Design a protein around this ligand. Structure first.
Ligand SMILES: Nc1ncnc2c1ncn2[C@@H]1O[C@H](COP(=O)(O)OP(=O)(O)OC[C@H]2O[C@@H](O)[C@H](O)[C@@H]2O)[C@@H](O)[C@H]1O
Length: 162
């Protein structure tokens, strides 16, 4: 009867202490410069056939460690309304994969808030879609970020719901 939790840590997600990781991935499965740079350095084997459409997630094992490649929309290319829909959908697929995998915990970044943000601050938009998808799972969720002001805002959002 474990109590599922949310936490946020400001550090490289490749150093996570959870049972699986979510990559903020690209649709063609190519290595990138954000989270995906770290994921490719740490779990390169998980990039075999990791390509998957925008708005979806695809899990590839590195050994027995699952890497869930979730592809948020690039808001430079999508309208605000369609990009919002694809971002929500990518997180829904993450929740389904976390559940299917049976893991007790997952390390997760904020999708579409960096390289794919279209130059806008999307912390709240992305975090709220994360909660909408993950709230109904019972895995411990650890959100990884790099910006010190974002850490505070994410922490505040978590705490105000408890
Ligand atoms: N190693 C990291 N650990 C934790 N957070 C990180 C890390 N690297 C970046 N971040 C932060 O994670 C959030 C998501 O940013 P991106 O990784 O750039 O993801 P996204 O906006 O979804 O862009 C995906 C695209 O970037 C490429 O890396 C990827 O291959 C894809 O083409 C941002 O707030 C970013 O500052």
């Amino acid at each position: 009867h474990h109590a599922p939790s949310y936490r946020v840590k400001r550090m490289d997600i490749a150093k996570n202490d959870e049972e699986c990781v979510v990559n903020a991935a690209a649709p063609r499965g190519l290595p990138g410069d954000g989270v995906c740079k770290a994921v490719y350095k740490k779990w390169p084997e998980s990039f075999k056939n990791s390509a998957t459409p925008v708005g979806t997630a695809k899990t590839v094992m590195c050994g027995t460690y699952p890497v869930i490649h979730a592809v948020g929309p690039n808001f430079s290319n999508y309208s605000e309304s369609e990009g919002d829909r694809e971002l929500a959908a990518a997180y829904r697929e993450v929740a389904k994969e976390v559940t299917r995998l049976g893991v007790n915990s997952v390390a997760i970044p904020l999708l579409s808030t960096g390289v794919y943000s279209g130059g806008k601050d999307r912390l709240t938009q992305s975090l709220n879609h994360l909660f909408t998808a993950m709230d109904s799972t019972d895995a411990d969720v650890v959100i990884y970020c790099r910006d010190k002001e974002w850490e505070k805002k994410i922490s505040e959002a978590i705490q105000m719901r408890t």
